[PDB]
mmCIF file of all heavy atoms in Angstrom:
data_model
loop_
_atom_site.group_PDB
_atom_site.id
_atom_site.type_symbol
_atom_site.label_atom_id
_atom_site.label_comp_id
_atom_site.label_asym_id
_atom_site.label_seq_id
_atom_site.Cartn_x
_atom_site.Cartn_y
_atom_site.Cartn_z
ATOM 1 N N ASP A 4 -11.417 20.757 -4.891
ATOM 2 C CA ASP A 4 -11.584 19.846 -6.018
ATOM 3 C C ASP A 4 -10.308 19.132 -6.334
ATOM 4 O O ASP A 4 -10.340 17.939 -6.611
ATOM 5 C CB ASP A 4 -12.087 20.610 -7.242
ATOM 6 C CG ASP A 4 -13.479 21.227 -7.028
ATOM 7 O OD1 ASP A 4 -14.156 20.899 -6.018
ATOM 8 O OD2 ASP A 4 -13.901 22.009 -7.923
ATOM 9 N N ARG A 5 -9.152 19.838 -6.283
ATOM 10 C CA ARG A 5 -7.867 19.195 -6.541
ATOM 11 C C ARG A 5 -7.504 18.235 -5.454
ATOM 12 O O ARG A 5 -6.927 17.187 -5.724
ATOM 13 C CB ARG A 5 -6.776 20.252 -6.696
ATOM 14 C CG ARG A 5 -6.817 21.089 -7.991
ATOM 15 C CD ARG A 5 -6.477 20.269 -9.247
ATOM 16 N NE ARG A 5 -6.282 21.175 -10.427
ATOM 17 C CZ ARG A 5 -5.079 21.680 -10.812
ATOM 18 N NH1 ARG A 5 -3.933 21.391 -10.153
ATOM 19 N NH2 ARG A 5 -5.031 22.498 -11.893
ATOM 20 N N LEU A 6 -7.836 18.567 -4.181
ATOM 21 C CA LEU A 6 -7.607 17.633 -3.082
ATOM 22 C C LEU A 6 -8.394 16.375 -3.258
ATOM 23 O O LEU A 6 -7.855 15.289 -3.079
ATOM 24 C CB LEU A 6 -7.953 18.295 -1.748
ATOM 25 C CG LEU A 6 -7.739 17.429 -0.481
ATOM 26 C CD1 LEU A 6 -6.290 16.923 -0.346
ATOM 27 C CD2 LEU A 6 -8.174 18.201 0.782
ATOM 28 N N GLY A 7 -9.697 16.497 -3.628
ATOM 29 C CA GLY A 7 -10.503 15.326 -3.926
ATOM 30 C C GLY A 7 -9.977 14.546 -5.072
ATOM 31 O O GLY A 7 -10.037 13.326 -5.050
ATOM 32 N N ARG A 8 -9.438 15.229 -6.110
ATOM 33 C CA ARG A 8 -8.810 14.549 -7.236
ATOM 34 C C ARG A 8 -7.665 13.696 -6.793
ATOM 35 O O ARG A 8 -7.527 12.573 -7.266
ATOM 36 C CB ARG A 8 -8.322 15.571 -8.258
ATOM 37 C CG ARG A 8 -9.471 16.000 -9.194
ATOM 38 C CD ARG A 8 -9.098 17.016 -10.284
ATOM 39 N NE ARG A 8 -8.156 16.368 -11.252
ATOM 40 C CZ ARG A 8 -6.807 16.357 -11.097
ATOM 41 N NH1 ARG A 8 -6.179 17.076 -10.137
ATOM 42 N NH2 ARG A 8 -6.064 15.588 -11.924
ATOM 43 N N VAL A 9 -6.810 14.226 -5.882
ATOM 44 C CA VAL A 9 -5.689 13.453 -5.352
ATOM 45 C C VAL A 9 -6.170 12.263 -4.592
ATOM 46 O O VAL A 9 -5.631 11.173 -4.766
ATOM 47 C CB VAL A 9 -4.789 14.346 -4.476
ATOM 48 C CG1 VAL A 9 -3.767 13.524 -3.657
ATOM 49 C CG2 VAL A 9 -4.053 15.334 -5.397
ATOM 50 N N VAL A 10 -7.206 12.453 -3.725
ATOM 51 C CA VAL A 10 -7.751 11.354 -2.931
ATOM 52 C C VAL A 10 -8.261 10.260 -3.831
ATOM 53 O O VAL A 10 -8.087 9.079 -3.542
ATOM 54 C CB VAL A 10 -8.848 11.867 -1.980
ATOM 55 C CG1 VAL A 10 -9.667 10.713 -1.357
ATOM 56 C CG2 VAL A 10 -8.169 12.710 -0.878
ATOM 57 N N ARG A 11 -8.903 10.643 -4.956
ATOM 58 C CA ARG A 11 -9.459 9.661 -5.880
ATOM 59 C C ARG A 11 -8.389 8.953 -6.648
ATOM 60 O O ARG A 11 -8.497 7.753 -6.875
ATOM 61 C CB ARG A 11 -10.436 10.347 -6.837
ATOM 62 C CG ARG A 11 -11.743 10.841 -6.192
ATOM 63 C CD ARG A 11 -12.752 11.460 -7.182
ATOM 64 N NE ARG A 11 -12.086 12.429 -8.113
ATOM 65 C CZ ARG A 11 -12.566 12.700 -9.357
ATOM 66 N NH1 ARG A 11 -13.725 12.163 -9.810
ATOM 67 N NH2 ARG A 11 -11.873 13.523 -10.179
ATOM 68 N N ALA A 12 -7.319 9.681 -7.060
ATOM 69 C CA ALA A 12 -6.242 9.076 -7.833
ATOM 70 C C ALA A 12 -5.474 8.085 -7.027
ATOM 71 O O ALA A 12 -5.054 7.065 -7.562
ATOM 72 C CB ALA A 12 -5.307 10.158 -8.371
ATOM 73 N N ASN A 13 -5.266 8.358 -5.710
ATOM 74 C CA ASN A 13 -4.572 7.396 -4.859
ATOM 75 C C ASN A 13 -5.352 6.126 -4.706
ATOM 76 O O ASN A 13 -4.773 5.045 -4.781
ATOM 77 C CB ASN A 13 -4.279 8.011 -3.489
ATOM 78 C CG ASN A 13 -3.357 9.242 -3.560
ATOM 79 O OD1 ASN A 13 -3.557 10.195 -2.797
ATOM 80 N ND2 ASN A 13 -2.366 9.237 -4.502
ATOM 81 N N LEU A 14 -6.693 6.228 -4.501
ATOM 82 C CA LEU A 14 -7.532 5.036 -4.412
ATOM 83 C C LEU A 14 -7.550 4.286 -5.706
ATOM 84 O O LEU A 14 -7.608 3.061 -5.700
ATOM 85 C CB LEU A 14 -8.955 5.424 -4.002
ATOM 86 C CG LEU A 14 -9.076 5.977 -2.561
ATOM 87 C CD1 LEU A 14 -10.466 6.605 -2.333
ATOM 88 C CD2 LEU A 14 -8.767 4.909 -1.493
ATOM 89 N N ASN A 15 -7.496 5.004 -6.853
ATOM 90 C CA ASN A 15 -7.465 4.345 -8.152
ATOM 91 C C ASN A 15 -6.193 3.575 -8.342
ATOM 92 O O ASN A 15 -6.210 2.457 -8.841
ATOM 93 C CB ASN A 15 -7.635 5.371 -9.269
ATOM 94 C CG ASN A 15 -7.645 4.785 -10.695
ATOM 95 O OD1 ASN A 15 -8.032 3.633 -10.915
ATOM 96 N ND2 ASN A 15 -7.165 5.612 -11.672
ATOM 97 N N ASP A 16 -5.042 4.162 -7.947
ATOM 98 C CA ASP A 16 -3.773 3.443 -7.990
ATOM 99 C C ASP A 16 -3.817 2.219 -7.128
ATOM 100 O O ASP A 16 -3.325 1.169 -7.529
ATOM 101 C CB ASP A 16 -2.631 4.363 -7.557
ATOM 102 C CG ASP A 16 -1.265 3.657 -7.567
ATOM 103 O OD1 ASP A 16 -0.954 2.982 -8.584
ATOM 104 O OD2 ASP A 16 -0.499 3.833 -6.581
ATOM 105 N N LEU A 17 -4.414 2.331 -5.917
ATOM 106 C CA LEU A 17 -4.537 1.184 -5.021
ATOM 107 C C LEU A 17 -5.315 0.071 -5.645
ATOM 108 O O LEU A 17 -4.862 -1.070 -5.629
ATOM 109 C CB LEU A 17 -5.198 1.617 -3.712
ATOM 110 C CG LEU A 17 -5.173 0.585 -2.555
ATOM 111 C CD1 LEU A 17 -5.062 1.307 -1.195
ATOM 112 C CD2 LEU A 17 -6.389 -0.367 -2.543
ATOM 113 N N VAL A 18 -6.508 0.384 -6.218
ATOM 114 C CA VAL A 18 -7.367 -0.652 -6.784
ATOM 115 C C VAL A 18 -6.750 -1.234 -8.023
ATOM 116 O O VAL A 18 -6.976 -2.398 -8.332
ATOM 117 C CB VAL A 18 -8.780 -0.096 -7.050
ATOM 118 C CG1 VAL A 18 -8.960 0.681 -8.368
ATOM 119 C CG2 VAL A 18 -9.776 -1.274 -6.980
ATOM 120 N N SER A 19 -5.939 -0.438 -8.759
ATOM 121 C CA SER A 19 -5.261 -0.946 -9.946
ATOM 122 C C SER A 19 -4.118 -1.858 -9.610
ATOM 123 O O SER A 19 -3.860 -2.815 -10.337
ATOM 124 C CB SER A 19 -4.758 0.214 -10.807
ATOM 125 O OG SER A 19 -5.850 0.938 -11.361
ATOM 126 N N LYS A 20 -3.401 -1.595 -8.492
ATOM 127 C CA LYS A 20 -2.386 -2.521 -8.007
ATOM 128 C C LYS A 20 -2.976 -3.753 -7.381
ATOM 129 O O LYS A 20 -2.316 -4.790 -7.331
ATOM 130 C CB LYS A 20 -1.477 -1.824 -6.990
ATOM 131 C CG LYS A 20 -0.549 -0.749 -7.594
ATOM 132 C CD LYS A 20 0.425 -1.247 -8.679
ATOM 133 C CE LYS A 20 1.339 -2.394 -8.222
ATOM 134 N NZ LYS A 20 2.299 -2.769 -9.287
ATOM 135 N N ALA A 21 -4.238 -3.676 -6.896
ATOM 136 C CA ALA A 21 -4.921 -4.842 -6.351
ATOM 137 C C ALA A 21 -5.417 -5.792 -7.410
ATOM 138 O O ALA A 21 -5.829 -6.904 -7.088
ATOM 139 C CB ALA A 21 -6.099 -4.400 -5.483
ATOM 140 N N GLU A 22 -5.385 -5.381 -8.699
ATOM 141 C CA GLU A 22 -5.957 -6.172 -9.787
ATOM 142 C C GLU A 22 -4.943 -7.161 -10.256
ATOM 143 O O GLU A 22 -3.903 -6.779 -10.791
ATOM 144 C CB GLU A 22 -6.396 -5.262 -10.929
ATOM 145 C CG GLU A 22 -7.725 -4.516 -10.713
ATOM 146 C CD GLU A 22 -7.862 -3.234 -11.549
ATOM 147 O OE1 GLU A 22 -6.976 -2.952 -12.397
ATOM 148 O OE2 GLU A 22 -8.879 -2.518 -11.342
ATOM 149 N N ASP A 23 -5.273 -8.443 -10.141
ATOM 150 C CA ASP A 23 -4.417 -9.494 -10.660
ATOM 151 C C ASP A 23 -4.748 -9.490 -12.153
ATOM 152 O O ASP A 23 -5.852 -9.099 -12.531
ATOM 153 C CB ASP A 23 -4.750 -10.843 -10.029
ATOM 154 C CG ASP A 23 -3.513 -11.592 -9.568
ATOM 155 O OD1 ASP A 23 -2.917 -11.183 -8.550
ATOM 156 O OD2 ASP A 23 -3.140 -12.587 -10.223
ATOM 157 N N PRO A 24 -3.816 -9.902 -13.006
ATOM 158 C CA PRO A 24 -4.076 -9.880 -14.447
ATOM 159 C C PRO A 24 -4.988 -10.970 -15.018
ATOM 160 O O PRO A 24 -5.888 -10.648 -15.791
ATOM 161 C CB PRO A 24 -2.674 -10.021 -15.048
ATOM 162 C CG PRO A 24 -1.904 -10.787 -14.027
ATOM 163 C CD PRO A 24 -2.460 -10.386 -12.689
ATOM 164 N N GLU A 25 -4.745 -12.229 -14.673
ATOM 165 C CA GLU A 25 -5.517 -13.327 -15.252
ATOM 166 C C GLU A 25 -6.845 -13.482 -14.598
ATOM 167 O O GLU A 25 -7.817 -13.798 -15.277
ATOM 168 C CB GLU A 25 -4.725 -14.632 -15.153
ATOM 169 C CG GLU A 25 -3.315 -14.633 -15.787
ATOM 170 C CD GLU A 25 -3.228 -13.780 -17.052
ATOM 171 O OE1 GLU A 25 -4.024 -14.006 -18.001
ATOM 172 O OE2 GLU A 25 -2.353 -12.876 -17.078
ATOM 173 N N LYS A 26 -6.919 -13.269 -13.256
ATOM 174 C CA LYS A 26 -8.193 -13.294 -12.545
ATOM 175 C C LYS A 26 -9.173 -12.336 -13.148
ATOM 176 O O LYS A 26 -10.269 -12.743 -13.531
ATOM 177 C CB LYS A 26 -7.954 -12.973 -11.068
ATOM 178 C CG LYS A 26 -7.035 -13.983 -10.364
ATOM 179 C CD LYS A 26 -7.007 -13.804 -8.840
ATOM 180 C CE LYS A 26 -6.048 -14.781 -8.149
ATOM 181 N NZ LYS A 26 -6.055 -14.581 -6.681
ATOM 182 N N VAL A 27 -8.775 -11.044 -13.276
ATOM 183 C CA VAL A 27 -9.668 -10.012 -13.787
ATOM 184 C C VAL A 27 -9.974 -10.242 -15.235
ATOM 185 O O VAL A 27 -11.084 -9.953 -15.673
ATOM 186 C CB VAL A 27 -9.057 -8.619 -13.543
ATOM 187 C CG1 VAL A 27 -9.920 -7.503 -14.171
ATOM 188 C CG2 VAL A 27 -8.946 -8.414 -12.017
ATOM 189 N N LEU A 28 -9.006 -10.775 -16.018
ATOM 190 C CA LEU A 28 -9.250 -11.079 -17.426
ATOM 191 C C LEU A 28 -10.314 -12.111 -17.601
ATOM 192 O O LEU A 28 -11.237 -11.916 -18.388
ATOM 193 C CB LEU A 28 -7.949 -11.556 -18.077
ATOM 194 C CG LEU A 28 -7.921 -11.655 -19.615
ATOM 195 C CD1 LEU A 28 -8.082 -10.284 -20.297
ATOM 196 C CD2 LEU A 28 -6.607 -12.322 -20.060
ATOM 197 N N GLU A 29 -10.207 -13.245 -16.855
ATOM 198 C CA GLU A 29 -11.200 -14.308 -16.935
ATOM 199 C C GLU A 29 -12.543 -13.821 -16.506
ATOM 200 O O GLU A 29 -13.540 -14.192 -17.110
ATOM 201 C CB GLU A 29 -10.753 -15.502 -16.091
ATOM 202 C CG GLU A 29 -11.781 -16.645 -15.983
ATOM 203 C CD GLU A 29 -11.146 -17.885 -15.351
ATOM 204 O OE1 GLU A 29 -10.209 -18.452 -15.974
ATOM 205 O OE2 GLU A 29 -11.597 -18.288 -14.246
ATOM 206 N N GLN A 30 -12.606 -12.961 -15.456
ATOM 207 C CA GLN A 30 -13.901 -12.455 -15.014
ATOM 208 C C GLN A 30 -14.498 -11.508 -16.000
ATOM 209 O O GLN A 30 -15.716 -11.477 -16.144
ATOM 210 C CB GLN A 30 -13.786 -11.782 -13.652
ATOM 211 C CG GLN A 30 -15.103 -11.346 -12.981
ATOM 212 C CD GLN A 30 -15.970 -12.571 -12.685
ATOM 213 O OE1 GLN A 30 -15.480 -13.705 -12.684
ATOM 214 N NE2 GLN A 30 -17.285 -12.328 -12.407
ATOM 215 N N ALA A 31 -13.660 -10.697 -16.697
ATOM 216 C CA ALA A 31 -14.157 -9.828 -17.755
ATOM 217 C C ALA A 31 -14.775 -10.624 -18.862
ATOM 218 O O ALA A 31 -15.782 -10.209 -19.433
ATOM 219 C CB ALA A 31 -13.024 -8.954 -18.291
ATOM 220 N N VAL A 32 -14.181 -11.801 -19.184
ATOM 221 C CA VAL A 32 -14.778 -12.684 -20.184
ATOM 222 C C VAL A 32 -16.078 -13.248 -19.695
ATOM 223 O O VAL A 32 -17.045 -13.292 -20.454
ATOM 224 C CB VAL A 32 -13.789 -13.800 -20.568
ATOM 225 C CG1 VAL A 32 -14.471 -14.959 -21.329
ATOM 226 C CG2 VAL A 32 -12.710 -13.151 -21.454
ATOM 227 N N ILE A 33 -16.131 -13.682 -18.410
ATOM 228 C CA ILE A 33 -17.320 -14.335 -17.864
ATOM 229 C C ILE A 33 -18.486 -13.400 -17.832
ATOM 230 O O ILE A 33 -19.593 -13.800 -18.176
ATOM 231 C CB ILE A 33 -17.006 -14.897 -16.464
ATOM 232 C CG1 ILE A 33 -16.044 -16.103 -16.597
ATOM 233 C CG2 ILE A 33 -18.299 -15.294 -15.706
ATOM 234 C CD1 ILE A 33 -15.411 -16.528 -15.269
#
């Protein structure tokens, strides 16, 4: 379970670094 937690946290960090700020903001509004 902890290994899976690590695997998930790394992917979450990746997807969070992939998020541009204004692009995602405008899409959240849309």
